């Protein structure tokens, strides 16, 4: 009941920031780039 952690189908690689599954570990790491490279109004730090 509510166990999850089951890769019945979806790839074991999914972005935990937006929600995107990729069929390549390298793809997931690359996508993150979009998350770590934006101009957030009022850039204080980061
Ligand atoms: Zn993402």
UniProtKB/Swiss-Prot annotation:
The gene is ZFP28. The chain holds residues 668 to 700 of 868 of the full protein. Belongs to the krueppel C2H2-type zinc-finger protein family. A zinc finger (C2H2-type) spans 13-35. This is Zinc finger protein 28 homolog. May be involved in transcriptional regulation. May have a role in embryonic development. It comes from the Eukaryota. It is found in: Nucleus. Disulfide bonds: none annotated.
């Amino acid at each position: 009941g509510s166990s999850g952690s089951s890769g019945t189908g979806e790839k074991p690689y999914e972005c935990k920031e937006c929600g995107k599954a990729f069929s390549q570990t390298t793809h997931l790491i690359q996508h993150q780039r979009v998350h770590t490279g934006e101009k957030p109004s009022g850039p204080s730090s980061g």
